Amino acid sequence: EVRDGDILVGKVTPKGETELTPEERLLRAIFGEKAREVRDTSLKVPHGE
């Protein structure tokens, strides 16, 4: 049983090779987690459904 905003299909695409702000890159060192070189673009449910 879903509500609106839930995730339907796990979809993910590569980003490429970009640069970051130094401030967020600092925080990623603070939280010790680089994510990946991909994009978080998955299938989710439309609203009121």
Binding site: E23, L26, A29
Partner: protein, 74 residues
């Protein structure tokens, strides 16, 4: 922008040295990542002195009272 403001409010509460080490290191006040000897060059210190104060600073940053307001900012 408010994220950068929280960077200011949290980052100004630590010591005088570590502010300049992190800012001049990570390219924050200027915008460019630098080598090891560049920010130790203005201080007249060694690379290991920078690395122990910076690494101990990274131990200070994982103190969770600071991390609580910053976890959602991921």
């Amino acid at each position: 922008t408010l994220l950068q403001d929280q960077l200011q409010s949290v980052l100004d509460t630590l010591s005088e040295r570590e502010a300049g080490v992190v800012r001049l290191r990570f390219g924050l006040t200027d915008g460019q990542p630098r080598t090891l000897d560049e920010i130790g060059q203005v201080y007249g210190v060694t690379r290991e002195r920078i690395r122990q104060i910076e690494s101990k600073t990274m131990s200070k940053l994982r103190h969770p009272s600071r991390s609580q307001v910053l976890r959602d900012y991921l």
